[PDB]
């Protein structure tokens, strides 16, 4: 360190809006959003700043972007969402924020996945619970034929099994 602090943080304003979001550069990201219409701008793989923030677990950036009009419904080129990226990592608070925006939860991506199948695959119990409560469909299958219960069973995830089964048992039998 030549000065009092590192110079690296002061060079951070050359980063793209996606990298700002990913790395949690709140000040430079906020300023960049004020001055240009860039909050929903996509990079070469169709990823938005919110996707990058979600995928890297940047809770404060996610909150800031949602509070400032970032569209949480957009999908990347692989048909991935901020929701599915966060579900993949088990970032429960990010997932909660996104679910509270009323995003779709059953979009089938080109990897053969859904947020629920990623949450199950990762053994992220709280995400699985929240997703089931927001209407996530446990019968949707991966490319190999595995639904959410199938994955939970095959992978040995006991708590995820219990959660899914309770949910299914809460479904009222049709009597009409």
């Amino acid at each position: 360190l030549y000065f009092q602090g590192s110079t690296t943080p002061l060079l951070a304003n050359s980063l793209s809006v996606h990298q700002l979001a990913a790395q949690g550069e709140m000040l430079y990201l906020a300023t960049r959003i004020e001055q240009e219409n860039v909050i929903n701008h996509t990079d070469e793989e169709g990823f938005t700043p919110l996707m990058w923030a979600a995928a890297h677990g940047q809770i404060a950036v996610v909150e800031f972007l949602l509070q400032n009009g970032a569209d949480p419904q957009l999908l990347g080129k692989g048909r991935e969402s901020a929701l599915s990226l966060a579900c993949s990592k088990g970032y429960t608070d990010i997932v909660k924020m996104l679910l509270d925006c009323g995003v779709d939860v059953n979009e089938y991506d080109w990897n053969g996945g859904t947020p629920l199948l990623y949450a199950v695959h990762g053994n992220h119990v709280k995400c699985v619970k929240m997703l089931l409560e927001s209407g996530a469909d446990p019968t949707i299958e991966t490319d190999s034929g595995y639904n959410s219960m199938d994955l939970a069973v095959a992978l040995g995830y006991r708590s995820v099994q219990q959660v899914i089964e309770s949910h299914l048992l809460k479904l009222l039998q049709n009597i009409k």
């Binding site: 690296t8 980063l15 990298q19 990913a22 790395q23 793989e45 990823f47 996707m51 990058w52 995928a55 890297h56 692989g78 991935e80 599915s84 990226l85 993949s88 990592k89 991506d109 990897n111 053969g112 996945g113 199948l117 990623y118 695959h121 990762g122 053994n123 991966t142 490319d143 190999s144 595995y146 994955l151 095959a154 992978l155």
Partner: peptide, 16 residues
């Protein structure tokens, strides 16, 4: 410095 986008997991395999 740049960080990568994590890739979505392969659902055809056990995670471990």
């Amino acid at each position: 410095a740049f960080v990568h986008m994590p890739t979505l997991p392969n659902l055809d395999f056990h995670k471990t």
